[PDB]
Enzyme design. Structure first.
Site, PDB file in Angstrom:
ATOM      1  N   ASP A 185       0.828  -1.210  -0.107  1.00 13.63           N
ATOM      2  CA  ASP A 185      -0.023  -0.029   0.022  1.00 13.63           C
ATOM      3  C   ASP A 185       0.907   1.376  -0.150  1.00 13.63           C
ATOM      4  O   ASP A 185       1.959   1.125   0.673  1.00 13.63           O
ATOM      5  CB  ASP A 185      -1.010   0.045   0.976  1.00 13.63           C
ATOM      6  CG  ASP A 185      -1.616   1.247   1.327  1.00 13.63           C
ATOM      7  OD1 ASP A 185      -2.699   1.198   0.382  1.00 13.63           O
ATOM      8  OD2 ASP A 185      -1.828   1.938   2.104  1.00 13.63           O
ATOM      9  N   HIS A 235     -10.424  -0.954  -5.574  1.00 12.54           N
ATOM     10  CA  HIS A 235     -10.036  -0.151  -4.407  1.00 12.54           C
ATOM     11  C   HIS A 235      -9.268   1.132  -4.983  1.00 12.54           C
ATOM     12  O   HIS A 235      -9.467   2.299  -4.778  1.00 12.54           O
ATOM     13  CB  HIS A 235      -9.367  -0.589  -3.329  1.00 12.54           C
ATOM     14  CG  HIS A 235      -8.638   0.040  -2.221  1.00 12.54           C
ATOM     15  ND1 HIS A 235      -9.887   0.650  -1.334  1.00 12.54           N
ATOM     16  CD2 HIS A 235      -7.550   0.688  -1.920  1.00 12.54           C
ATOM     17  CE1 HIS A 235      -9.060   1.763  -0.603  1.00 12.54           C
ATOM     18  NE2 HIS A 235      -7.736   1.455  -0.811  1.00 12.54           N
TER      19      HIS A 235
END
Ligand code: CL
Ligand code: CL
Ligand code: CL
Ligand code: CL
Ligand code: CL
Ligand code: CL
Ligand code: CL
Ligand code: CL
Ligand code: CL
Ligand code: CL
Ligand code: CL
Ligand code: CL
Ligand code: CL
Ligand code: CL
Ligand code: CL
Ligand code: CL
Ligand code: CL
Ligand code: CL
Ligand code: NA
Ligand code: NA
Ligand code: NA
Ligand code: NA
Ligand code: NA
Ligand code: NA
Lengths: 309, 309, 309, 309, 309, 309
Positions: free
Chosen positions: A150, A224
């Site tokens: 991430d 996402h």
């Protein structure tokens, strides 16, 4: 930023992290104790960095909307500093929960975060009550707890993260400040782990192993990274820091996003929870439940000093 | 140790630590799931050390007295493996509290401890319930959370810590094993911090700054290091790992002591809580409250493998 | 090992590696130049470790079967030192290819490997010709180039790798020595990358992300880790070091396995290439082609010194 | 070593070093203060290593011949512990100079050496006077101050340095101990730097760049490494630690050599200063002047503890 | 630089390096695949730096003169981007050899360079063919493979290397870009090593040990650092990265020089190969043969993004 | 700073430090040798940083008032560059002592400081004589030798240290330069160590353990940090580097303070030695004696280069 030095709002994610949210009490020392911390905040950071110059120590301090007006009635108010309004979709809700003060503490060793936090505890004794304390950690090569790297989308390399994290001359009285939004997410790890990797990649929008973004042809519109990248070069600086109590089967992500304008963060949240178009919600929310949500204003160091006078 | 390789019971204290105590459930898979972990434990450690050879990864696994007999009725039992009997002094009590399995996980990065712990969670799903999970950290140069260096008395340099931590031929069927005792202590930090340093040094028995032991003339008979060093070259290998939630004003020490014979640990506890002579209790207990206390047996790797068959 | 110090045959895999295989020439200085290296080998290692004590420098030196007899006709011969006999299965072949001298050079920096190798070049000038030089690197957290962690099965933690890598009193004249086998494998990365992760895991026998071994129920009988773990606690110490020229689409694994007895390595190879039972071949060979295969004897340091006299 | 643990006499050379030589005073506390240090020495080392486990902290403590008999009249005496007798050659002299106590302090940071040394100062106040204090440093990749790597000849890799540094059963009452000899050398750097590299290599006996030993054909009989390697596998463990005050043009080497038998060190010194055969003196002495020379006995930790009782 | 962010053209030399030169193919996907890499280049770098923030990862991408015009006919062209014209002296020739794309990949670990390069291989499949791939390494304290420190002359400390490496407003449409020139040199190491150090120093123009520049009186006019420092504060940012296959006796330097104006690099090359005055050629060319020579244009990140649209 | 690059006057304190003060001789080469160092100073720094990029190497060079005028009669003179005038209080004196050249050398390894200093020795041979050489070290987490963290008050975090250390347009001909003042202090460690910690904290003005500044209510007006922080945002950049010869009971602090204006440093010194108001002297001077005191001018790199022409 009008010559104002920002707090560490474009910092990288620490190896060890403490997130503390406090509520103010009604004690007759509360304002003074908070102002003592404001006045001495950059000194506390100087001390840590002087003592441990290689440990990448950082702390940011932010204020909730109601708290700001209570503490500092005559300082004006940032244009977008208002209590977060819950975003309720057809299925998922980004809840709005309490918090007056935020401390985001990062370092290469957890003991240094503890040290700083213990001094905050001492200085604020009687002035605050704990709303939440969460301890986080860097997981492998910057992976979120769901096993995907991430943060690659954070502005960097050919963009300046301060440009996206720090208020500019559009709100000159608060230039050098930042809007920070936090959410605790609890994951359904059993359901997540039951997904084959190829389906997990469709939920996230990047390849699991090599962190390469899926092609437009391969990336679903509800991935996402599709829904949270709102476009038009509107960006924020995000962490999604892992936290867990594995013995209780508790796995979570502590989201924290710093922005020059909260409108970007809020648009991202709309895309996730309502969907753009409506119903096109973030697929990752099928595995992640938001249980907190709070906006804070992180003043420039200059302003922070004034607040402490 | 009869050619038996011990678990990491004489290891140094990690930078990051997870202590997990589980109770067994009555599920019809409980014994098998525990045995799967026993069978695969050294493989899980091999994996971590192969992947991260410089991160000092370690995990130890221990069994409570009742749990041992439930799980392994035909394996015999270590001579001193019996449920800890509460030690009640005139003022203080070393409580005896539940726990069937102990995992003590250490590494240079908390993310690696999490990784290992998450796999334990998966493997033991349905077989266990969490009694306690505590996360600890190294604080500065090996300080306990009360600001004094801890662990200098551990056998080292001119003594071999394995000699003091590992069962020998006095109980040959379990040679290579260890008795580990854990206690969570909660500190009265406000009272502690109100003591001048010179009084704190009299409570501990060492100088705060330089970790030099107080002279016999200066050291009181109720100093922590006076009462816990029982003499006659009887020693254990101890940590006192800091843990805290500073936002709630919660400061603690997670005591963990590995011993070749639990009789040494128990004598230390008698000296602390009852006093030798009676009433000469550990002065540090005026600032520290024991809220858990459990004995576990940590088998040699050889025996652990047999347990998993 | 009869008091003989082995070479670094149970070492971990370096961050940077050079594998050099030489053939001897017929020059009238060849034996003397090789003996000069034998005589000075431990000194060359001492020099590197003295200069760079934290760089984990290591080199091993081995001899081919024919070369051993040519160079050292009166020193006897290890019981299993014979030219590798090609293993030809119904589909795949473990080829047997030339090589008289092997140098396996490892360090935390490639520049140190180069330094050592350059001195070997100088000392052996005219005495040797290059058969192969391959440069390898550690890939992430000890991954093989196919993206799976490799080496977790190597004896460690509850077993001593020297026991499995080093000749003992079963061949006392060569105790402290080792049998090392090398193979260069070229991968079909396009075909490999086309496999979903779950199929890749069935080929390897471990989970890709967390390196946890597949359960017996889930692991196919032709998985790499099923067929290469021959059982009965017969083991070798292996690397599978990545090498590549990505610009040419060339991806490979340099296999190197150190063994107390070559019979174990050979049985592993039979299981892979012929199958146990016949036809149950290593599924990883559907994506990997062996293009070299050579056995060398790695003498103890004591013997190496004698060879150089 | 009769089960006796030696001090760190086969340690590698630290990054930072303090050499302190003290003489005893005639105060009525002198013996007791020295015994306090003996009694607490391993504890002081434990403290440092507990606090700074990655800083490679070490200290050794030794006694001069006269001092030993004064302090410990009833403990017997090592067979070769006698005041060093000056070795006077036709041109050069290895002087014999005073010293009752030696402390050799090493660590990755000079601040840790200082810490330990300051505690020695405090504990020995009134009992000692400084004869010499020299601070040294590691220079590049283990170079001596003359720009050549030093220490490659120290037993290592295929030999055990403890075998050469530590007294064995030939003097059983002192097994685990060591004979340490120190000399301060002052260099004529102007003359040294005027030598071409090829002549410098003939003085040293190794190549300057790559630390490869000169061939027998190329190495002169008066080269430093020719004359100091006395042969017959008789060896000591040496440092030659750089020290300097460049502002005064002062450049030196602090020689320290630990030996199982001082006879080896003394034979080396004879070869250097007298010559074998006579006149074949160490060519490096044409650029280096010995200004101190003292023998100390370094007891095992076991014996050191007894001395402190 | 007109607000344009340059690629890493003033970076330090990595510990591990990959130099890849590709030629374009005539496939009907070639332009699109190259543009995909352009579009995603800064993202690929972001990914590496996010995952491995302490590994100093860097990659630069450049285009050959003919390739630029083929790929981007409507983007204009940098003023000095023209195919390098061979420089033929009386004795030596700086050859001009093919190359359409250059990737210069650097990191603290070779595995990270491999990772990035493998993704380039995948993305460019069918669009390119390998012209050259060379792997380099840092050698000791920044030494070139000839044993002399290289790079000390690079602008730094009291000068800004970007000023010398990056195009400015003199070619505003390409400000933020750079001209990079690469040459592979093969050394005659046998001849070089036969030179005494003092002669080697006259060839280079600096002292071998301490990297101090020779005095004007001592430095010959044909020394490498005399002829390549063209004067008038005209400078480039250079590496001379070692590469080698020692088993084949192959030792080389991969020259790479980044410049704000290729005219400086070309003048340096004239001084080396022709001589200023004619015949005063770089003495280092008596030991070094250029076997490649190619100019590439390295666009700013801004422009690179536009190229990928 | 008028586009002038300053020397490293706002650098952090090194791990290892050498302070050298030289006086000029009357030799007929003195000016030329000093100018050679001026001309080559940034090159010497480039060399160190190129060779050891991770060792934080730094050196600053400054000139005494008389020396400046002798060496550079036609370069003008900084407005405040005048020989320091001794400050004599009723009890304590800040002495003014000789010094023509100052070198302040810092690095992560002492060997690198030595290297640089040795080259200065060679280049300045015959032109200088040593006035003082002191070697310092970082002590723990940036503690001064009296056991309190020092340097936390240095401008940082929300202030730019260059603003306070570097001359600006108020003296444009010397913008980019700095005024540096050095003092050696010798401590009465026996008296200091006899003070309880709480009294030591009143002498310093900060807490010993956690480096938190005493409250106004708790901090005496004669505390070191009260009297040396002169107010009105007038600040300098200071070290107080430990040095010691513990064997002689010698403990000291080498003060070095870089300032944009020496008037600030001088006002600080007045506050310490005379008192503001008179008699309100720095309490730390009851334990610390100044034995040197000298002002130097540290030119910008640009000016330094001009000086060397
Ligand atoms: Cl640090
Ligand atoms: Cl207000
Ligand atoms: Cl809102
Ligand atoms: Cl690691
Ligand atoms: Cl059983
Ligand atoms: Cl009990
Ligand atoms: Cl090293
Ligand atoms: Cl033979
Ligand atoms: Cl065979
Ligand atoms: Cl440490
Ligand atoms: Cl005695
Ligand atoms: Cl003698
Ligand atoms: Cl990293
Ligand atoms: Cl175009
Ligand atoms: Cl051209
Ligand atoms: Cl470095
Ligand atoms: Cl002048
Ligand atoms: Cl003055
Ligand atoms: Na109040
Ligand atoms: Na069951
Ligand atoms: Na011959
Ligand atoms: Na006495
Ligand atoms: Na196409
Ligand atoms: Na002159």
């Amino acid at each position: 930023f009008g010559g104002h030095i920002p707090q560490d709002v474009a910092g990288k994610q620490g190896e060890n992290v403490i997130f503390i949210v406090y509520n103010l009490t009604d004690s007759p020392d509360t304002v003074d104790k908070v102002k003592d911390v404001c006045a001495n905040f950059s000194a506390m950071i100087r001390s840590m960095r002087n003592r441990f110059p290689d440990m990448q120590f950082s702390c940011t301090m932010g204020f909730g909307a109601d708290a700001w007006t209570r503490l500092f009635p005559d300082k004006g108010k940032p244009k977008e500093l208002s209590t977060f309004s819950e975003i309720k979709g057809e299925k998922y809700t980004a809840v709005s929960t309490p918090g007056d003060l935020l401390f985001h503490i990062r370092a290469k060793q957890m003991g240094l975060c503890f040290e700083f936090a213990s001094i905050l505890d001492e200085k604020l004794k009687g002035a605050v009550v704990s709303v939440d304390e969460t301890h986080g950690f860097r997981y492998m090569d910057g992976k979120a707890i769901i096993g995907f790297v991430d943060g690659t989308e954070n502005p960097a390399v050919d963009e300046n993260p301060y440009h996206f994290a720090v208020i500019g001359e559009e709100d000159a009285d608060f230039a050098g400040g930042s809007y920070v939004f936090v959410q605790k997410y609890i994951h359904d790890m059993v359901a997540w782990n039951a997904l084959p990797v190829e389906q997990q990649e469709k939920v996230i929008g990047r390849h699991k192993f090599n962190d390469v973004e899926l092609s437009d042809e391969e990336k679903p519109g509800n991935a996402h990274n599709a829904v949270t990248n709102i476009g038009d070069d509107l960006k924020i600086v995000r962490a999604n820091m892992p936290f867990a109590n594995t013995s209780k089967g508790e796995y979570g992500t502590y989201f924290i996003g710093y922005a020059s304008t909260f409108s970007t963060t809020r648009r991202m949240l709309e895309n996730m929870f309502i969907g753009s178009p409506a119903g096109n919600t973030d697929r990752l929310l099928d595995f992640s439940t938001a249980i907190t949500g709070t906006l804070f204003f992180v003043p420039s160091y200059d302003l922070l000093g004034e607040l402490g006078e």
